[PDB]
Design an enzyme around this catalytic site. Structure first.
Site, PDB file in Angstrom:
ATOM      1  N   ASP A   1       0.825  -1.220   0.000  1.00 54.49           N
ATOM      2  CA  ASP A   1       0.000   0.000   0.000  1.00 54.49           C
ATOM      3  C   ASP A   1       0.850   1.257   0.000  1.00 54.49           C
ATOM      4  OD1 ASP A   1      -1.979   1.918   0.580  1.00 54.49           O
ATOM      5  OD2 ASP A   1      -3.240   0.276   1.246  1.00 54.49           O
TER       6      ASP A   1
ATOM      7  N   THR B   1      -6.845   3.413  -2.080  1.00 51.73           N
ATOM      8  CA  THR B   1      -6.666   1.976  -1.926  1.00 51.73           C
ATOM      9  C   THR B   1      -7.777   1.142  -2.510  1.00 51.73           C
ATOM     10  OG1 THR B   1      -5.383   2.214   0.068  1.00 51.73           O
ATOM     11  CG2 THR B   1      -6.328   0.075  -0.322  1.00 51.73           C
TER      12      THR B   1
ATOM     13  N   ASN C   1     -12.919   5.398  -1.629  1.00 44.56           N
ATOM     14  CA  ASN C   1     -12.794   4.767  -0.347  1.00 44.56           C
ATOM     15  C   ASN C   1     -14.057   5.006   0.490  1.00 44.56           C
ATOM     16  OD1 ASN C   1     -10.190   3.677  -0.672  1.00 44.56           O
ATOM     17  ND2 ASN C   1      -9.200   5.215   0.620  1.00 44.56           N
TER      18      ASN C   1
ATOM     19  N   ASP D   1       2.171   2.827   3.178  1.00 41.84           N
ATOM     20  CA  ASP D   1       1.129   3.845   3.208  1.00 41.84           C
ATOM     21  C   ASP D   1       0.910   4.403   4.602  1.00 41.84           C
ATOM     22  OD1 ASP D   1      -1.471   4.973   1.632  1.00 41.84           O
ATOM     23  OD2 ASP D   1      -2.119   4.223   3.581  1.00 41.84           O
TER      24      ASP D   1
ATOM     25  N   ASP E   1      -0.553  -0.153  -4.979  1.00 41.92           N
ATOM     26  CA  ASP E   1      -1.881   0.383  -5.322  1.00 41.92           C
ATOM     27  C   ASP E   1      -1.855   1.834  -5.800  1.00 41.92           C
ATOM     28  OD1 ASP E   1      -1.429   1.312  -2.680  1.00 41.92           O
ATOM     29  OD2 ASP E   1      -3.548   0.994  -2.036  1.00 41.92           O
ATOM     30  N   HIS E   2      -0.959   2.640  -5.221  1.00 47.56           N
ATOM     31  CA  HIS E   2      -0.760   4.018  -5.617  1.00 47.56           C
ATOM     32  C   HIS E   2       0.486   4.559  -4.874  1.00 47.56           C
ATOM     33  CE1 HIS E   2      -2.105   4.882  -1.590  1.00 47.56           C
ATOM     34  NE2 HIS E   2      -3.078   4.021  -1.817  1.00 47.56           N
TER      35      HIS E   2
ATOM     36  N   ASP F   1     -20.503   7.159 -21.219  1.00 35.90           N
ATOM     37  CA  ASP F   1     -20.076   5.788 -20.891  1.00 35.90           C
ATOM     38  C   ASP F   1     -18.733   5.392 -21.482  1.00 35.90           C
ATOM     39  OD1 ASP F   1     -20.818   5.373 -23.564  1.00 35.90           O
ATOM     40  OD2 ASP F   1     -22.089   3.654 -23.148  1.00 35.90           O
TER      41      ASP F   1
ATOM     42  N   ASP G   1     -21.512   6.577 -29.289  1.00 34.92           N
ATOM     43  CA  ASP G   1     -22.964   6.605 -29.201  1.00 34.92           C
ATOM     44  C   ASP G   1     -23.636   6.010 -30.432  1.00 34.92           C
ATOM     45  OD1 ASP G   1     -22.819   7.962 -26.833  1.00 34.92           O
ATOM     46  OD2 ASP G   1     -23.412   9.888 -27.718  1.00 34.92           O
TER      47      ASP G   1
HETATM   48  C1  LIG Z   1     -14.838  -1.546 -19.366  1.00 37.70           C
HETATM   49  O1  LIG Z   1     -15.084  -2.973 -19.488  1.00 37.70           O
HETATM   50  C2  LIG Z   1     -16.403  -3.332 -19.109  1.00 37.70           C
HETATM   51  C3  LIG Z   1     -16.639  -4.836 -19.205  1.00 37.70           C
HETATM   52  O2  LIG Z   1     -16.514  -5.327 -20.523  1.00 37.70           O
HETATM   53  C4  LIG Z   1     -17.442  -2.633 -19.987  1.00 37.70           C
HETATM   54  O3  LIG Z   1     -18.670  -2.731 -19.260  1.00 37.70           O
HETATM   55  C5  LIG Z   1     -19.712  -3.426 -19.982  1.00 37.70           C
HETATM   56  O4  LIG Z   1     -20.391  -2.611 -20.926  1.00 37.70           O
HETATM   57  C6  LIG Z   1     -21.304  -3.448 -21.645  1.00 37.70           C
HETATM   58  C7  LIG Z   1     -21.714  -2.753 -22.924  1.00 37.70           C
HETATM   59  O5  LIG Z   1     -22.435  -1.607 -22.577  1.00 37.70           O
HETATM   60  C8  LIG Z   1     -22.469  -3.829 -20.713  1.00 37.70           C
HETATM   61  O6  LIG Z   1     -23.509  -4.535 -21.384  1.00 37.70           O
HETATM   62  C9  LIG Z   1     -21.884  -4.697 -19.607  1.00 37.70           C
HETATM   63  O7  LIG Z   1     -22.803  -4.994 -18.576  1.00 37.70           O
HETATM   64  C10 LIG Z   1     -20.725  -3.937 -18.959  1.00 37.70           C
HETATM   65  N1  LIG Z   1     -20.055  -4.725 -17.928  1.00 37.70           N
HETATM   66  C11 LIG Z   1     -19.661  -4.194 -16.773  1.00 37.70           C
HETATM   67  C12 LIG Z   1     -18.973  -5.100 -15.783  1.00 37.70           C
HETATM   68  O8  LIG Z   1     -19.841  -3.023 -16.455  1.00 37.70           O
HETATM   69  C13 LIG Z   1     -17.111  -1.155 -20.173  1.00 37.70           C
HETATM   70  O9  LIG Z   1     -17.853  -0.625 -21.237  1.00 37.70           O
HETATM   71  C14 LIG Z   1     -15.632  -0.892 -20.460  1.00 37.70           C
HETATM   72  N2  LIG Z   1     -15.393   0.536 -20.542  1.00 37.70           N
HETATM   73  C15 LIG Z   1     -14.808   1.098 -21.629  1.00 37.70           C
HETATM   74  C16 LIG Z   1     -14.630   2.584 -21.628  1.00 37.70           C
HETATM   75  O10 LIG Z   1     -14.433   0.447 -22.617  1.00 37.70           O
HETATM   76  C1  LIG Z   2      -5.721 -10.048  -7.545  1.00 34.53           C
HETATM   77  C2  LIG Z   2      -5.110  -8.928  -6.722  1.00 34.53           C
HETATM   78  C3  LIG Z   2      -5.888  -8.708  -5.436  1.00 34.53           C
HETATM   79  C4  LIG Z   2      -5.412  -7.511  -4.625  1.00 34.53           C
HETATM   80  C5  LIG Z   2      -4.849  -7.880  -3.242  1.00 34.53           C
HETATM   81  C6  LIG Z   2      -5.877  -8.447  -2.261  1.00 34.53           C
HETATM   82  C7  LIG Z   2      -5.565  -8.181  -0.775  1.00 34.53           C
HETATM   83  C8  LIG Z   2      -6.153  -6.838  -0.306  1.00 34.53           C
HETATM   84  C9  LIG Z   2      -6.506  -6.669   1.175  1.00 34.53           C
HETATM   85  C10 LIG Z   2      -6.714  -5.177   1.502  1.00 34.53           C
HETATM   86  C11 LIG Z   2      -7.360  -4.871   2.851  1.00 34.53           C
HETATM   87  C12 LIG Z   2      -7.611  -3.371   3.017  1.00 34.53           C
HETATM   88  C13 LIG Z   2      -7.699  -2.937   4.478  1.00 34.53           C
HETATM   89  C14 LIG Z   2      -7.877  -1.431   4.690  1.00 34.53           C
HETATM   90  O1  LIG Z   2      -8.996  -1.046   4.959  1.00 34.53           O
HETATM   91  O2  LIG Z   2      -6.802  -0.410   4.652  1.00 34.53           O
HETATM   92  C15 LIG Z   2      -6.972   0.840   3.931  1.00 34.53           C
HETATM   93  C16 LIG Z   2      -5.943   1.942   4.262  1.00 34.53           C
HETATM   94  O3  LIG Z   2      -4.822   1.843   3.378  1.00 34.53           O
HETATM   95  C17 LIG Z   2      -6.495   3.371   4.091  1.00 34.53           C
HETATM   96  O4  LIG Z   2      -6.745   3.733   2.710  1.00 34.53           O
HETATM   97  P1  LIG Z   2      -5.785   4.661   1.758  1.00 34.53           P
HETATM   98  O5  LIG Z   2      -4.371   3.937   1.350  1.00 34.53           O
HETATM   99  O6  LIG Z   2      -5.684   5.998   2.304  1.00 34.53           O
HETATM  100  O7  LIG Z   2      -6.497   4.733   0.343  1.00 34.53           O
HETATM  101 CA   LIG Z   3     -21.736   6.663 -25.279  1.00 33.05          CA
HETATM  102 CL   LIG Z   4     -13.008   8.607  -1.969  1.00 31.00          CL
HETATM  103 ZN   LIG Z   5      -3.543   2.444  -0.554  1.00 27.84          ZN
HETATM  104 ZN   LIG Z   6      -3.256   5.939   2.165  1.00 29.33          ZN
END
Ligand SMILES: *[C@@H]1O[C@H](CO)[C@@H](O[C@@H]2O[C@H](CO)[C@@H](O)[C@H](O)[C@H]2NC(C)=O)[C@H](O)[C@H]1NC(C)=O
Ligand SMILES: CCCCCCCCCCCCCC(=O)OC[C@@H](O)COP(=O)(O)O
Ligand SMILES: [Ca+2]
Ligand SMILES: [Cl-]
Ligand SMILES: [Zn+2]
Ligand SMILES: [Zn+2]
Ligand SMILES: Cc1c(Sc2cccc(C(=O)O)c2F)c2ccc(Cl)c(F)c2n1CC(=O)N1CC2(CC2)c2ccccc21
Ligand code: NA
Ligand code: NA
Length: 776
Positions: A118, A156, A177, A258, A305-306, A660, A664
């Protein structure tokens, strides 16, 4: 036995009532059996074998063991062989290429361990081997990027869940968050129980994708109260389980650096210790894996994460200094702002008025208000009911708060995801990743597909571009295929005379397509139109080009349009009057003017200039936007050609009225030039391409390409640009930089496919199309 964790510690199930739980997440549901602490969280003598424990008689109270039966019992400390059996720590060994996985019999695939950290800022990797030797060995021996770009907001929860799903927050639903869902009428918070309700968490995360396809993900989440060293010992023990039980993917989460970064700032001298402490955990994992002979079997991803920025109390803007009424709004505050009405039944609530009150009111004001649909398209932060209509993008190093009454911290994050301080890390080490390989920066939306490939899974639909990171891997199970063209172009010849037209227009009278034509990926009707100076794909449905392509050499001259030709518009004798724009529409629309996709200013001769005034090259533009567009075309294009040794430009309209991020259908278009079927674009794009090796001109480039692109909002005013009262040289390029974009962003927004005939490999072109020119 029901009711006790004896023989059940970290079992790979969640036992339900009347039984109690013994899994890694039981603490988070206050559900562990009475004896879980006693049996499953042993701590005696800490985590390290010492010389005095070698040859010890086993003591069952110890956290881990150093005895000659410990390997058979599956419970050695991670350093047992090093301290007691003369073996080296993993980190002290030479990098040795892993040409194929070396896993025990019965491992069907290399396991994957995701080690997430983190707030680990990209630049922390500079500290190197002196502070983080294990991590540095992963980084230098494995595959790494200089940084990885998080999603916005750079906090996060949105980022971890993007890592998990491959989705933008607007799609997965974890848009902050903290959030308010108006359909649930509920609030999700960092602290509290509401976030554990799975109803918030959309898409299909990796652990679910795995389970659905018969890959074991075990008990994926740890209760964060469990110490890191116990999690590592447990992961290693799980890796000794029989084939029918052993998971193929594991995750570890560290709340550092973090936690300390918030207290001390990103570069506080206090940050050194937490980074050393993370490295110690990485060393335990790697020593542990070597002890099990799994150190050339497991793929390890080390990912943040960032990042973290220097942010202090005194650098806070207050809405109360801008708004005449702060009591009727609710603000999500901090390194971003989200504003909604405090009360539900408030007919007086006026978002436009609130935005105006927040627009360019103080010199060097440290945030900018937007309606969400007007945020830079690259943020993809609008299409969710949990995103408030009013958004404030806050300046790096600042906070926003509602009132003064609302220092204890010196760092924070959450800002725009192109801000350098927000960038984080990626390292991939193991049999499937490349050896000692550096790869360009990429976005965290891409990693889900990679994790799927590493586990033999078909990814759920997501926002990564599958194939775009093939260069990170030694071997690729996925071969991307170029999408098939959906609508074939027409190629009209000379079909009319000028006198066949009555458009109300008057006039006082391949080099340009370097990477093949774009492909149209929707059902429509369009014409390819060729000209001396430009080529276009002209939509007979939208009455304008979908794309206009032209190459500008380094030595090209810019010319002006003679006074007698400033309003010249000419009918195009290849295109029916019925599928043409008309000039009467613009004359009758007091608010709307027009511009050109290929600029007359870049004509190759005064005779060729007449092509640029064709009705088929014109597009509807507000006068306020023409300030932007004219400066881009008349000044910047030639500048870029000079800098880059020629550029190829592709420009066109975008229609995204429902924000979106997708092209369109016609029914979504809400605005037309008055009394016409001429649709008004929401944005205009350009893709600017040249030779990465700038000693070669853009049209004779033998090697890799260099691209930069944008998606400019087509707005009837320049309220976004606080210095727009000044000359365009003070503000237009700044606007363009804020609205930088990936080619892939434009592809989604246009249903076009670019770069189809470059003679480079398709995965390389995918990387090119996912590139973002950040301007930092
Ligand atoms: C990001 O990817 C997601 C998943 O493919 C896209 O979301 C879908 O959009 C379709 C078409 O409108 C919907 O029918 C699905 O239900 C959506 N799925 C989800 C999980 O939201 C989304 O369009 C993508 N974004 C971009 C900008 O390409
Ligand atoms: C497939 C990849 C999965 C990603 C990893 C899965 C494990 C993640 C478990 C995360 C538990 C988070 C607990 C929590 O609540 O802490 C947040 C703090 O930081 C405060 O937030 P921030 O850094 O200020 O944004
Ligand atoms: Ca659109
Ligand atoms: Cl936020
Ligand atoms: Zn974080
Ligand atoms: Zn933080
Ligand atoms: C609830 C939750 C959290 S916070 C959290 C998690 C674990 C421990 C603690 C702690 O305080 O000890 C904590 F505060 C979290 C963090 C990162 C990620 Cl990336 C998630 F996804 C998270 N989630 C959803 C989560 O775990 N799902 C969503 C879903 C899709 C529906 C699903 C299915 C199956 C299993 C799990 C899940
Ligand atoms: Na007009
Ligand atoms: Na302005």
């Amino acid at each position: 036995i029901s009711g006790s964790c004896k023989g059940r510690c970290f079992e790979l199930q969640e036992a339900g009532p009347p039984d109690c739980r013994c899994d890694n997440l039981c603490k988070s549901y206050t559900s562990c059996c009475h004896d879980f602490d006693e049996l499953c969280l042993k701590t005696a003598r800490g985590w390290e074998c010492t010389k005095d424990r070698c040859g010890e008689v086993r003591n069952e109270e110890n956290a881990c063991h150093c005895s000659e039966d410990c390997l058979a019992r599956g419970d050695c400390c991670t350093n047992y062989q090093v301290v007691c059996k003369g073996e080296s720590h993993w980190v002290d060994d030479d990098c040795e290429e892993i040409k194929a996985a070396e896993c025990p019999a019965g491992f069907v695939r290399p396991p994957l361990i995701i080690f997430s950290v983190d707030g680990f800022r990209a630049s922390y990797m500079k500290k190197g081997s002196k502070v983080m030797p294990n991590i540095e060995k992963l980084r230098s021996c494995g595959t790494h990027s200089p940084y990885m770009r998080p999603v916005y907001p750079t906090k996060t929860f949105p980022n971890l869940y993007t890592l998990a799903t491959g989705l933008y927050p607007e799609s997965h639903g974890i848009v902050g968050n903290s959030m308010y869902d108006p359909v649930f009428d509920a609030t999700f918070h960092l602290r509290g129980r509401e976030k554990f309700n799975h109803r918030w968490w959309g898409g299909q995360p990796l652990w679910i994708t795995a389970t659905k396809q018969g890959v074991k993900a075990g008990t994926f989440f740890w209760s964060v109260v469990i110490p890191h060293e116990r999690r590592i010992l447990t992961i290693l023990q799980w890796l000794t389980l029989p084939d029918h039980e052993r998971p193929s993917v594991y995750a570890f989460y560290s709340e550092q650096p973090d936690f300390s970064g918030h207290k001390y700032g990103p570069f506080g001298p206090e940050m050194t210790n937490p980074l050393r402490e993370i490295d110690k955990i990485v060393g335990q994992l790697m020593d542990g894996l070597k002890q099990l002979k799994l150190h050339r079997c497991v793929n390890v991803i080390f990912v943040g994460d960032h990042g973290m920025e220097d942010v202090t109390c005194d650098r806070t803007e207050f809405l109360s200094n801008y708004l005449t009424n702060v009591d009727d709004i609710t603000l999500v505050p901090g390194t971003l702002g989200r504003i909604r009405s405090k009360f539900s039944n408030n007919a007086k609530y006026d978002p436009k008025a609130i935005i105006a009150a927040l627009t360019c009111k103080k010199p060097d004001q440290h945030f900018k208000p937007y309606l969400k649909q007007h945020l830079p398209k690259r943020l993809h932060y609008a299409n969710n009911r949990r995103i408030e209509d009013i958004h404030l993008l806050v300046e790096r190093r600042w906070h926003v708060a509602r009132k003064p009454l609302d220092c204890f911290f010196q760092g924070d994050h959450g800002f725009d995801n192109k801000v350098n301080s927000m960038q984080t890390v990626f390292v991939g080490y193991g049999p499937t990743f490349k050896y000692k390989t550096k790869v360009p920066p990429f976005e965290n939306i891409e990693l889900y597909n990679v994790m799927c490939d590493l586990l033999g899974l078909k990814p759920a639909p997501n926002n990564g571009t599958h194939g775009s990171l093939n260069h990170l891997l030694r071997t690729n199970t996925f071969r991307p295929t170029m999408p098939e063209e959906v609508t074939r172009p027409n190629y009209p010849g000379i079909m009319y005379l000028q006198s066949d037209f009555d458009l109300g227009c008057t006039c006082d009278d391949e080099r340009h397509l370097l990477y093949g034509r774009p492909a149209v990926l929707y059902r429509t009707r369009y014409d390819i139109l060729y000209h001396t100076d430009f080529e276009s794909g002209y939509s007979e449905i939208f009455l304008m080009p979908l794309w206009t392509s032209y190459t500008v050499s380094k030595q090209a001259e810019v010319s002006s349009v003679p006074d007698h030709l400033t309003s010249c518009v000419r009918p195009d004798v290849r295109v029916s009057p019925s599928f043409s724009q008309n000039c009467l529409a613009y004359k009758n629309d007091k608010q709307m003017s027009y511009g050109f996709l290929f600029p007359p200013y870049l004509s190759s001769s005064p005779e060729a200039k007449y092509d640029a005034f064709l009705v088929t090259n014109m597009v509807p533009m507000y006068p306020a936007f023409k300030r932007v567009w004219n400066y881009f075309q008349r000044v910047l294009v030639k500048k870029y050609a000079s800098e880059r040794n020629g550029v190829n430009v592709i420009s066109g309209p975008i229609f995204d009225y429902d924000y979106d991020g997708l092209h369109d259908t016609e029914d979504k278009i809400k605005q037309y030039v008055e009394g016409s079927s001429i649709p008004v674009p929401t944005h205009y794009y350009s893709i600017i391409t040249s030779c990465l090796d700038f000693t070669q001109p853009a049209d004779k480039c033998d090697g890799p390409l260099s691209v930069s692109s944008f998606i400019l909002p087509h707005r009837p005013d320049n309220e976004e640009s606080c210095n727009s009262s000044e000359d365009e040289s003070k503000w237009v390029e700044e606007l363009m930089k804020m609205h930088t974009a990936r080619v892939r962003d434009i592809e989604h927004l246009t249903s076009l496919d670019f770069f189809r005939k470059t003679s480079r490999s398709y995965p390389e072109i995918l990387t090119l199309k996912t590139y973002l020119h950040t301007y930092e």
